[PDB]
Amino acid sequence: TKLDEQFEKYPKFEINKVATELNRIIAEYRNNRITVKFRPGDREASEELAN
Amino acid sequence: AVGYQLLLRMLSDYSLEPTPQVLSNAQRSYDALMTDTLVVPSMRRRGDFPVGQGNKYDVFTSDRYYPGDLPLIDGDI
């Protein structure tokens, strides 16, 4: 506001409290990473192909 | 208002007394005059009051605390 011929601004304090669960989920993923795995079939040489 | 106040001041010169209606009219005129010259100073902040991170004191405004004085360009206090 003008506030006696000036432009003092409103105080805007930020207390971030929503990132805790996001950090927990990210740590949960990074503790157990997953990747692609190929499973063999019912053939004579599917095991070597999968390996 | 000025005339009524001046009359109230000079009534005692001629050894007179003011009737209540004159007093009421003078009071009303004085209130009307005093209405037109209001101030309402609208006090400012403290001076060490923190300025929140929401105001972006890193890039938008260089200072991180409330000034407490009129900023300028060259007078610089």
Describe the 3D structure.
The structure is cut from a larger assembly and holds chains A (51 residues) and B (77 residues). By secondary structure, chain A is mainly alpha-helical. Chain A contains 2 helices and no strands. The relative contact order of chain A is 0.08. Chain B is mainly alpha-helical and 77 residues long. Chain B has 2 helices and no strands. In chain B, helix 1 (2-10) crosses helix 2. The chains are: A mainly alpha (51), B mainly alpha (77).
Main β-sheet of chain B: number of strands, strand sense, barrel status?
none
Question: Structural class, from secondary structure content of chain A?
Answer: mainly alpha
Helix segment count of chain B? 2
Order of helices and strands of chain B: HH
Strand content of chain B: under 5%
β-strand number of chain B: 0
- Ends of chain A: how far apart? 71 Å
Structural class of chain B: mainly alpha
Radius of gyration of chain A: 28 Å
Rg of chain B, please? Answer: 26 Å
| Helical fraction of chain A | 25-40%
Oligomeric state as shown = part of a larger assembly
The dominant shape of chain B is rod-shaped
Largest contact between chains: A-B, 9 and 13 residues
By DSSP, the count of extended strands of chain A is 0
Strand content of chain A: under 5%
